[PDB]
């Protein structure tokens, strides 16, 4: 899924992309993956960056609003990086060295 936030009279300001591993896939080391995006005049590559003080933002137990600034800590999303928020992870793999495995 993808979802996004609209500022009035301006356009879409930020986007959140939900990602999951395919059946049977071996674990993926998220912090080495690169995200390429194309649009009307620019083709940009973004690299992983740490959430505040910790590798991945731990919201395994729910978020009041994924876009509210004070709750979520968007600030490290610079013009050249992304950050990762962990939504479901039983085995604590996301939470510790950022590895996606089955069911995350």
């Amino acid at each position: 899924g993808v979802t996004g936030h609209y500022v009035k009279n301006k356009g879409i300001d930020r986007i959140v992309i939900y990602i999951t591993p395919n059946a049977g896939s071996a674990p993926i080391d998220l912090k080495q993956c690169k995200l390429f995006l194309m649009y009307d005049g620019k083709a940009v590559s973004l690299n992983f960056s740490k959430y505040d003080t910790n590798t991945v933002g731990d919201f395994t137990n729910g978020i009041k609003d994924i876009f509210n600034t004070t709750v979520v800590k968007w600030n490290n999303a610079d013009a050249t990086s992304f950050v990762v928020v962990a939504l479901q992870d039983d085995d604590k793999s996301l939470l510790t060295n950022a590895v996606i495995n089955k069911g995350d």
Binding site: P27, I28, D29, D91, K92, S93, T96, N97, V99, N101
Partner: protein, 53 residues
């Protein structure tokens, strides 16, 4: 017979992820056994014993 050669490498070789390890056990006579593996891309805390080769 089967027997396990036990080596403690904690300070001698720095086996972090994605690292190639090469070697041989060389007998007094006869052909050497060749050790050759690359450590996994990711180590998980739920799986402390890893099968390398």
């Amino acid at each position: 017979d089967i027997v396990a050669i036990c080596l403690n490498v904690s300070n001698t070789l720095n086996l972090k992820p994605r690292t190639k390890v090469t070697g041989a056990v060389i007998p007094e006579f006869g052909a050497p056994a060749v050790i050759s593996f690359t450590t996994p891309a990711t180590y998980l805390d739920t799986q402390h014993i890893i099968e390398l080769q």
